[PDB]
Design an enzyme around this catalytic site. Structure first.
Site, PDB file in Angstrom:
ATOM      1  N   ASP A  10       0.746  -1.237   0.000  1.00 33.50           N
ATOM      2  CA  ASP A  10       0.000   0.000   0.000  1.00 33.50           C
ATOM      3  C   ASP A  10       0.802   1.330   0.000  1.00 33.50           C
ATOM      4  O   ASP A  10       0.280   2.339  -0.493  1.00 33.50           O
ATOM      5  CB  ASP A  10      -0.999  -0.060   1.167  1.00 33.50           C
ATOM      6  CG  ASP A  10      -2.167  -1.038   0.905  1.00 33.50           C
ATOM      7  OD1 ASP A  10      -2.482  -1.354  -0.276  1.00 33.50           O
ATOM      8  OD2 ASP A  10      -2.784  -1.465   1.898  1.00 33.50           O
ATOM      9  N   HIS A  35     -10.158  -0.965  -2.496  1.00 28.78           N
ATOM     10  CA  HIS A  35      -9.056  -1.159  -3.488  1.00 28.78           C
ATOM     11  C   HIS A  35      -9.424  -2.076  -4.599  1.00 28.78           C
ATOM     12  O   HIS A  35     -10.112  -3.080  -4.377  1.00 28.78           O
ATOM     13  CB  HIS A  35      -7.797  -1.714  -2.832  1.00 28.78           C
ATOM     14  CG  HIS A  35      -7.258  -0.846  -1.744  1.00 28.78           C
ATOM     15  ND1 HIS A  35      -6.215  -1.242  -0.934  1.00 28.78           N
ATOM     16  CD2 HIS A  35      -7.653   0.376  -1.298  1.00 28.78           C
ATOM     17  CE1 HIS A  35      -5.998  -0.300  -0.028  1.00 28.78           C
ATOM     18  NE2 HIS A  35      -6.848   0.696  -0.233  1.00 28.78           N
ATOM     19  N   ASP A  43      -7.707  -4.228  -5.946  1.00 26.58           N
ATOM     20  CA  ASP A  43      -7.105  -5.564  -5.733  1.00 26.58           C
ATOM     21  C   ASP A  43      -8.025  -6.437  -4.869  1.00 26.58           C
ATOM     22  O   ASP A  43      -7.917  -7.634  -4.872  1.00 26.58           O
ATOM     23  CB  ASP A  43      -5.617  -5.497  -5.259  1.00 26.58           C
ATOM     24  CG  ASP A  43      -5.414  -5.063  -3.775  1.00 26.58           C
ATOM     25  OD1 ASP A  43      -4.245  -5.244  -3.253  1.00 26.58           O
ATOM     26  OD2 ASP A  43      -6.363  -4.526  -3.118  1.00 26.58           O
ATOM     27  N   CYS A  80      -2.310  -7.748  -0.303  1.00 27.40           N
ATOM     28  CA  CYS A  80      -2.185  -6.560   0.553  1.00 27.40           C
ATOM     29  C   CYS A  80      -0.928  -6.543   1.450  1.00 27.40           C
ATOM     30  O   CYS A  80      -0.424  -5.468   1.777  1.00 27.40           O
ATOM     31  CB  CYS A  80      -3.407  -6.421   1.460  1.00 27.40           C
ATOM     32  SG  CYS A  80      -4.959  -6.656   0.601  1.00 27.40           S
TER      33      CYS A  80
HETATM   34  C1  LIG Z   1      -5.869  -5.304   0.633  1.00 29.08           C
HETATM   35  C2  LIG Z   1      -5.120  -4.013   0.787  1.00 29.08           C
HETATM   36  N1  LIG Z   1      -4.420  -3.429  -0.177  1.00 29.08           N
HETATM   37  N2  LIG Z   1      -5.290  -3.703   2.077  1.00 29.08           N
HETATM   38  C3  LIG Z   1      -4.989  -2.716   3.107  1.00 29.08           C
HETATM   39  C4  LIG Z   1      -6.218  -2.846   4.007  1.00 29.08           C
HETATM   40  C5  LIG Z   1      -5.973  -3.058   5.491  1.00 29.08           C
HETATM   41  C6  LIG Z   1      -5.596  -1.837   6.320  1.00 29.08           C
HETATM   42  N3  LIG Z   1      -6.012  -2.132   7.706  1.00 29.08           N
HETATM   43  C7  LIG Z   1      -5.938  -1.270   8.724  1.00 29.08           C
HETATM   44  O1  LIG Z   1      -5.494  -0.142   8.571  1.00 29.08           O
HETATM   45  C8  LIG Z   1      -6.414  -1.700  10.091  1.00 29.08           C
HETATM   46  C9  LIG Z   1      -6.094  -0.942  11.232  1.00 29.08           C
HETATM   47  C10 LIG Z   1      -6.537  -1.340  12.499  1.00 29.08           C
HETATM   48  C11 LIG Z   1      -7.300  -2.495  12.641  1.00 29.08           C
HETATM   49  C12 LIG Z   1      -7.630  -3.257  11.530  1.00 29.08           C
HETATM   50  C13 LIG Z   1      -7.187  -2.858  10.261  1.00 29.08           C
HETATM   51  C14 LIG Z   1      -6.204  -0.602   5.740  1.00 29.08           C
HETATM   52  N4  LIG Z   1      -7.489  -0.327   5.971  1.00 29.08           N
HETATM   53  O2  LIG Z   1      -5.486   0.097   5.068  1.00 29.08           O
END
Ligand SMILES: *CC(=N)NCCC[C@H](NC(=O)c1ccccc1)C(N)=O
Ligand SMILES: *CC(=N)NCCC[C@H](NC(=O)c1ccccc1)C(N)=O
Ligand SMILES: [Ca+2]
Ligand SMILES: [Ca+2]
Ligand SMILES: [Ca+2]
Ligand SMILES: [Ca+2]
Ligand SMILES: [Ca+2]
Ligand SMILES: [Ca+2]
Ligand SMILES: [Ca+2]
Ligand SMILES: [Ca+2]
Ligand SMILES: [Ca+2]
Ligand SMILES: [Ca+2]
EC number: 3.5.3.15
Lengths: 626, 626
Positions: free
Chosen positions: A313, A434, A436, A608
């Site tokens: 990311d 996203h 993806d 991710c």
């Molecule tokens: C699939 C992709 N490119 N994913 C990034 C998504 C996960 C990420 N998660 C968090 O920031 C998060 C913080 C605290 C608790 C749970 C998840 C996001 N949203 O960027």
């Protein structure tokens, strides 16, 4: 073009640059009919002749002069009873050529695209060959290493003149003030002649034959306010008169085009895999997958991560390409989470460039994470070729108070790299948002040499309905996990609000399916649906019901697929079996990785958690006609 | 494009927008061969058939529905021993069309240039129809006068739907956030639906047949960061499910191109002349010249002038043009001298637009005065047409510490109006530094329908040498003026440093001659030299030796030429006679105006003291292919 006026009153002296059109005005100052033209053997006149203004006299030299006025033109005016009267022209021929790799082989006035086009290429000097500096090499005005010159473009001034020629002439190298902030030029023998502080510079050139080498680097990528061309011009000045100002005699130019930043689709062979270090067994699995795919492996530790596991990311690894030099370049996303430093500290380096866009202290969305930045494989669309594919990124369907978008500065940048003509897809229905999360691309040995994979609730309902029809309705989703509420196929199918949610998700995915069909030229036979359920939660935004299998790591024919933990029928997860039945016929190898209690529960999957540097296209971007 | 999935398990309901491609997926959820297709007479299926996925079924409606699901599709699946099984599709056809004047008559997805192109035109609403406001009409978010709507572009939404349709569907009008600061849209019955504050708006539309009118105005001219296109889109949303989010069903768009600002060459018929009020007899002469040329006359008084007599220099009167509306628009120069207010206070007004560029508190050159901004007449150049001519403006030959240029913001603006592809000429050798100091254009009845006039020391030396040869060497330049050192032809010719100066000026003029030849497609037979001497003074910069005759007011065939006060031979100034001998054969009328002790001595002439609004070209700028 030059028009020399000849006068019997007094001889004229002129310089002639070879390759230029020199014409004579014989009439203006003619006496009082008829004229004749005698010239020394170095001069070819093209034109015993009447004194008609409209008849043209052209003068061309074959060789540089050995001395001033060493070629002569004599014009004889005469009439019925008039002794012939002579006008004298003394010419000095010189060779002044500004050269670059305009044919793009490594060695018209305009830069043109395509295989029959012309125009030299300049790379932005945004890598860091220098020891223990933190800056890209092009931030100072010095060539600090010898290796740095490999990123730069060669330009040569060849001159052939009399030994004393630059007694009364001077050459200046220049760039418009408009463009000086985007280029830097060094003189070789190694210091700056042109750049941000200086738009022109007087060259010290000796008479005779001389060759002077310059090295040129770009400082800016093409962008909204920079179409990507830089013109450098040489002017020949007459400095013969000590009182009077300099007088331009000849100008010539070369036009450079700055290399665009280019992404690499999943169908390009992988070279290096990235992730974060807990997830020890997650790391084991990608470690073996990298090994199988012959990839270097780099890992970011807890210290550096600052708890940031989403290596997909913060960054996107593309490349820039010129006939003399191709290098990988990291597009560093403004999301500036715990991985903020990783692209700066140890992805940027020797033959690894850097670039970033967007506001860096706050002003960002989830859709500025580079899981929301992808590219298609090469495609041709209703006859238009996209031989580097088309950048794909997620957006909403229309802007509202509640919709998100990737920052305009990022979109604008991606578009100004014309060569992968971006397509906006609809991803804002997803919690994270996203592209993806619902698409991937894999290599295939037939048709167009890939498949588009799309997440598909349709396929999963079909899969589970068939299971039940075959007697497995009591089969449990989430068999494996010690702390999660398990669920029977029967109850999954009978849950009406789950089915409504997945009808809505299907619609959102279908909308993009059709968008990709139009914009990418796909037939259904290009597309594989991957069984995938979703649920709406929090603002009616979609998350994955089980680990999102489309969100996979593509390492050639080796796939890192999130382990769904589906109903186990005859000793196997039927989701895994369905996926294998879909992708194995293409000769792909599926490894299912447990990402459940490390990635999945924090709203992401294997793609991710990872990133990949892949091989740049062999097709040369400048041979496209965007 | 839309793919409806049909299921025997349960009927499907779909909307179909007329003009769209609707296809069926009959295989995905088929039971267990063969299928048949029966549909109500409103539906045309194009396609007793086998259950092969690759065979396509398309559905087209001819008319809007009168009620929901009032058209039916029935798909019959069958096999060797299986009673036929029915899937039901209930369709609702609707008409949703967003219309604009895409054919450019006043009434593809992209805007295209040229006579076979498509795309509607938008004017910037930069005039002031409103009583006693000081602002351009487009600075607020209101249509304040009925007349203001004449500057705006009409766009209509036609819909034909069932009476209850918008119970479960909603329409939204939108513009990218990217573009919202450059457009405003009003709804008619009259208030804003889209604009700088709002990128989308939910329309209130009743079922049945309805037509809703919008008025659209642009807020920005095309510029470096704005290519000049604005897309407005209508989206049809399904709001059937009270829990679930809105779902886009159909999108359609219109793409507008913003009208460029366009200049008018001296060969366009004049309509209105401007100057400043001492110069009473100067004003008399232009007053009669305007009368002869049928022009309105406006004058700026001492109070408003603030001592500024250079009415050429603060402003340039061009125009903007759309099929529904053409208006004059003043480009107000940043030089912001005593005339600073004139373009704002009483040139801007009802059907007279305004625009300005550049830094307004300081950061300017002499070359930002609009005596340094001109256009050629229409020209074709090595096959490329420039049917509105090419903007011409002065610059140096290369940038040095001592060179001047027009401000980049002005150059960038002029270029972004693509339609008169600017050409940089060399004017920085002149003290004041304006292209009008050495060129003018006049109408002519033959060849290309104009002549380029160029100042020419060559011609004046020739003229004076002939005079002397004929015995008039004692003839006095400056006969007429009571307080100036007069000079004999003999002494003018024998002054060697004057001749050196004029050799240098000739070179500077020759350089441009050849530039204009290349860039404008001129032959010598297009060009008339006007006898003109110069002198170098102060930084070796050129001023006119006698009143600069090329710097004339062109009012059709009526010319306002600075009175040179040349040697009087046989009762006439021979300069005046030479000019008359050159221009009268073209059917031009020369009046020589005494500008000596009011303009000339402050470094300017008649053109510099005046300005002209001229008739816009009849050729439509959008029919060019730039
Ligand atoms: C699939 C992709 N490119 N994913 C990034 C998504 C996960 C990420 N998660 C968090 O920031 C998060 C913080 C605290 C608790 C749970 C998840 C996001 N949203 O960027
Ligand atoms: C020909 C043209 N477009 N001319 C403007 C040139 C004259 C003007 N003159 C002065 O500012 C001036 C001030 C004080 C004394 C004498 C002249 C200019 N340079 O803009
Ligand atoms: Ca450097
Ligand atoms: Ca480097
Ligand atoms: Ca970052
Ligand atoms: Ca390097
Ligand atoms: Ca990515
Ligand atoms: Ca208004
Ligand atoms: Ca108006
Ligand atoms: Ca102004
Ligand atoms: Ca108006
Ligand atoms: Ca002007």
């Amino acid at each position: 073009g030059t028009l020399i006026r000849v006068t019997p009153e007094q001889p004229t002296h002129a310089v002639c640059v070879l390759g230029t059109l020199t014409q004579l005005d014989i009439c203006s100052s003619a006496p009082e009919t008829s004229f004749s033209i005698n010239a020394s053997p170095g001069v070819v006149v093209d034109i015993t002749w009447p004194l008609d203004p409209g008849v043209e006299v052209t003068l061309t030299m074959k060789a540089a002069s050995g001395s001033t006025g060493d070629q002569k033109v004599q014009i004889s005016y005469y009439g019925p009873k008039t002794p012939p009267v002579k006008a004298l022209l003394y010419l000095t021929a010189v060779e002044i050529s500004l050269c670059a790799d305009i044919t793009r082989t490594g060695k018209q006035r305009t830069w043109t695209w395509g295989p029959c086009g012309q125009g030299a290429i300049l790379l932005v000097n945004c890598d860091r060959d220098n020891l223990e500096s933190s800056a890209m090499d092009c931030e100072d005005d010095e060539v600090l290493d010898s290796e740095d010159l490999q990123d730069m473009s060669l330009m040569t001034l060849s001159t052939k003149t009399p030994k004393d020629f630059f007694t009364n002439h001077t050459l200046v190298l220049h760039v418009a003030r408009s463009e000086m902030d985007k280029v830097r030029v060094f003189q070789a023998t190694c210091s700056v002649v042109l750049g941000p502080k200086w738009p022109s510079h007087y060259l010290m050139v000796p008479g005779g034959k001389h060759n002077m080498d310059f090295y040129v680097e770009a400082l800016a990528f093409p962008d909204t306010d920079f179409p990507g061309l830089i013109t450098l011009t040489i002017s020949l000045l007459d400095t013969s008169n000590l009182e009077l100002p300099e007088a331009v005699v000849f100008q010539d130019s070369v036009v450079f085009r700055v290399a665009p930043w280019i992404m690499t689709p999943n169908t390009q062979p992988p070279q290096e895999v990235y992730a974060c270090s807990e997830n020890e067994d997650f790391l084991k699995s990608v470690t073996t997958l990298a090994m199988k795919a012959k990839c270097k492996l780099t890992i970011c530790p807890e210290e550096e991560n600052m708890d940031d596991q989403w290596m997909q990311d913060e960054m996107e690894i593309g490349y820039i390409q010129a006939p003399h030099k191709t290098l990988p370049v990291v597009f560093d996303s403004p999301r500036n989470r715990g991985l903020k430093e990783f692209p700066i500290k140890r992805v940027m380096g020797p033959d690894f460039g850097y670039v970033t866009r967007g506001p860096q202290t706050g002003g960002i969305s989830g859709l500025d994470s580079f899981g929301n930045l992808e590219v298609s494989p090469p495609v041709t669309v209703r006859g238009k070729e996209y031989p580097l594919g088309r950048i794909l990124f997620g957006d909403s369907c229309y802007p509202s108070n509640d919709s998100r978008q990737m920052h305009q500065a990022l979109q604008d940048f991606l578009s100004a790299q014309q060569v992968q003509a971006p397509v906006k897809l609809y991803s804002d229905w997803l919690s994270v948002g996203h592209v993806d999360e619902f698409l991937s691309f894999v290599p295939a040995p037939d048709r167009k040499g890939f498949r588009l994979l799309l997440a598909s609730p349709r396929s999963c309902y079909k899969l589970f309905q068939e299971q039940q029809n075959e007697g497995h309705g009591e089969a449990l989703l989430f068999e494996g996990i010690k702390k999660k509420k398990q669920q029977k196929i029967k109850n999954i199918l009978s849950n009406k609000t789950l089915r409504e949610h997945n009808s809505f998700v299907e619609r959102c995915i279908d909308w993009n399916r059709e968008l990709l069909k139009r914009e990418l030229g796909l037939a259904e036979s290009d597309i594989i649906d991957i069984p995938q359920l979703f649920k709406l939660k929090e603002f009616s935004k979609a998350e994955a019901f089980f680990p999102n299998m489309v969100n996979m790591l593509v390492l050639g024919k080796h796939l890192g697929i999130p382990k769904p933990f589906g109903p186990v029928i005859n000793g196997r997860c039927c989701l895994e079996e369905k996926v294998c039945s879909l992708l194995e016929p293409l000769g792909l190898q599926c490894t299912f990785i447990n990402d459940f209690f490390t990635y999945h529960i924090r709203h992401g999957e294997v793609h991710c958690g990872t990133n990949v540097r892949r091989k740049p296209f062999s097709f040369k971007w400048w041979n496209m006609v965007p």
